[PDB]
């Protein structure tokens, strides 16, 4: 498995044409503020293809 390719799985809003977003902030899911921590209702935006 080659895990050197990633794709942004979670996003707050849709991406604009010809726009680049390289941030790795914690996706705010649900209603509990993540405040930077991961776990329940807080997923990582990037995911490996495998």
């Amino acid at each position: 498995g080659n895990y050197n390719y990633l794709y942004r799985l979670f996003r707050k809003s849709n991406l604009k044409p010809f726009e680049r977003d390289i941030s790795t902030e914690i996706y705010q899911a649900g209603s509990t503020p993540c405040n930077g921590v991961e776990g329940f209702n807080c997923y990582f935006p990037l995911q490996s293809y495998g």
């Epitope: 895990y3 790795t24 405040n35 930077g36 921590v37 807080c42 990582f44 990037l46 490996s48």
Partner: antibody, heavy 120, light 109 residues
Framework: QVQLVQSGAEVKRPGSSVKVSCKAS????????FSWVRQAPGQGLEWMGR????????HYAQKFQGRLTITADKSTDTAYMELTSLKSDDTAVYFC?????????????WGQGTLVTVSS | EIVLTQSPGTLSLSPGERATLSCRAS???????LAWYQQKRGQAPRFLIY???SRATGIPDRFSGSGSGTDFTLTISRLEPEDFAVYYC?????????FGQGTKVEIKR
């Protein structure tokens, strides 16, 4: 469930390049970050650094910015640690933790630890 | 956020009473980001409480904590002989994670 198996103690000399391994079995290796924490005898814990396997980026501390070299093999699911110019006060128990992939995290799993004696 | 100091340090408590381990905050922990552990004699630490209020799956109900902005506690009721170890504090509200010195609970003989 996260069996973080490590290696044994290594008797080194003052000034070397140690290489401690940490077998990360159980769940996947890329969905969780890893951090190494030293434990000096009777001096609590100290966070040295952290590695992100999915991003291949490290975040060292102020006292290890340039000396510590923490890597992680994404094939054998093993995290490594390397430190250059080992001084006398480096005889601590190096633990292996599996932190989350966030800016703020806790050390939920741990390891058996390695009593790497440098001063010999 | 950088300094954690255990107030008791040592506590010779009877096997079955209640204990209180303090960890005073230094730089006004923002979102109650503190963690508790249990480092037994010659073993690895065990995660007990995250966020200073919520417990972990598998931890007995006797372990509990309280604290809002500058002082967190650890309320353990009816300490069994197995719960006699060193407990540390870890804050994750700032960028550099820091620890404390640890409080050793010994048997009251």
């Amino acid at each position: 469930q996260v069996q973080l198996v490590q290696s044994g103690a290594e008797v080194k000399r003052p000034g070397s390049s140690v290489k401690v391994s940490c077998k990360a079995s159980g769940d996947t290796f890329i969905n969780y970050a890893f951090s190494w924490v030293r434990q000096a005898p009777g001096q609590g814990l100290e966070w040295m650094g952290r590695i992100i396997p999915i991003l291949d980026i490290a975040h060292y501390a102020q006292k290890f910015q340039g000396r510590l070299t923490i890597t992680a093999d994404k094939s054998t699911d093993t995290a490594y640690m390397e430190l250059t110019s080992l001084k006398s006060d480096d005889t601590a128990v190096y633990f292996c933790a599996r932190v989350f992939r966030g800016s703020q995290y806790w050390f939920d799993p741990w390891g058996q630890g390695t009593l790497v004696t440098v001063s010999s | 956020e950088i300094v954690l100091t255990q107030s008791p340090g040592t506590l010779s408590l009877s096997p079955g009473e209640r204990a209180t381990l303090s960890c005073r905050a230094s730089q006004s922990i923002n979102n109650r980001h503190l963690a508790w552990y249990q480092q037994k004699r010659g073993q690895a630490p065990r995660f007990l409480i995250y966020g200073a209020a919520s417990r972990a799956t598998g931890i007995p109900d006797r372990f509990s904590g309280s604290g809002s902005g500058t002082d967190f506690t650890l309320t353990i009721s009816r300490l069994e002989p197995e719960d006699f170890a060193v407990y540390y504090c870890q804050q994750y509200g700032s960028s550099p994670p820091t620890f404390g010195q640890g409080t050793k609970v010994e048997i009251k003989r």
